[PDB]
Each structure stands twice: as structure tokens, then as C-alpha cells.
């Protein structure tokens, strides 16, 4: 959907080892993050590796990339905000 709630975007999370690896590949140096930071780094990961489609740039192709293994889909749109949340939550432990 869109506009995920503020307190969700601020949830403190511990990425599991695969998502941690990805985060660390774009310069993140922590064990714990907010969701908004995780999304920031994944953003950066996609930009830097150019995983977006050249012609339809809201589509991300993640087959044959680590991102593909994290999300378990061959692609997704950047407009599908809840789906993205949902795929990322599988890859982390909420901090209590």
C-alpha cells in the first residue's frame, strides 16, 4: 500500500545473517537498526547494483541476487510498500 505507520517505521530490529550481510555490503556497521534504516540501506543496495529495470524503473528484478534469496520473489514493485515490509520482516527479529 503506502504511508506505513510512523511507529512501524521506527521499530528496532535485529537483521538475521543474510539481510545483515546485504546491509554490511552498502556500509552499515551495526547489529541493530530501525526499519527505516533497513529500507534506506536496501534502497542503496538496489541503486548501487542497478537491480531496477532500465525501462520501468519502479520494478526491481532480484533473481540471481542475494536480494532474491532474502525476498523469495523474482521481482516486485517499489510502490508495494506493505509487501516490502512483509518480505523484510521474515528476515529479522523485532527487538523487545
Ligand X SMILES: C[C@H]1CC[C@H](Cn2c(N3CCO[C@@H]4CCC[C@H]43)nc3cc(-c4noc(=O)[nH]4)nc(-c4cncc(Cl)c4)c32)CC1
* Contact residues for ligand X, defined by CB under 6 A: 2, 39, 42-43, 46-47, 52, 58, 78-79, 81, 84
Q: In angstroms, what is the minimal distance from the CB of 37 to ligand X?
A: 11
Give the nearer residue to ligand X in terms of CB position, either 23 or 46: 46
Closest separation in Å from C-beta 35 to ligand X: 9
Closer to ligand X by Cβ: residue 78 or 94: 78
Cα separation values, 52 from 12, 15, 29, 37, 38, Å: 28, 23, 25, 20, 18
Question: Per this entry, what is the length of the chain?
Answer: 96
Cite the beta strand spans of the chain per DSSP E: 12-15, 33-34, 59-61, 75-77, 92-94
CB of 57 to ligand X, least distance (A): 6
Cβ atoms 14, 37 nearer than 8 A: no
Q: CB-wise, 52 or 89, nearer to ligand X?
A: 52
Indicate the residue whose CB is closest to ligand X.
43
* CA–CA dist 80, 58 (Å, integer): 10
Amino acid at each position: 500500500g503506502s504511508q506505513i505507520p510512523a511507529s512501524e517505521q521506527e521499530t528496532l530490529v535485529r537483521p538475521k545473517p543474510l539481510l545483515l550481510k546485504l546491509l554490511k555490503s552498502v556500509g552499515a556497521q551495526k547489529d541493530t537498526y530501525t526499519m527505516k534504516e533497513v529500507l534506506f540501506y536496501l534502497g542503496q543496495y538496489i541503486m548501487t547494483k542497478r537491480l531496477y529495470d532500465e525501462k520501468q524503473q519502479h520494478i526491481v528484478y532480484c533473481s540471481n541476487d542475494l536480494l532474491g534469496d532474502l525476498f523469495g520473489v523474482p521481482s516486485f514493485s517499489v510502490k508495494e510498500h506493505r509487501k516490502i515490509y512483509t518480505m523484510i520482516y521474515r528476515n529479522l527479529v523485532v527487538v523487545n
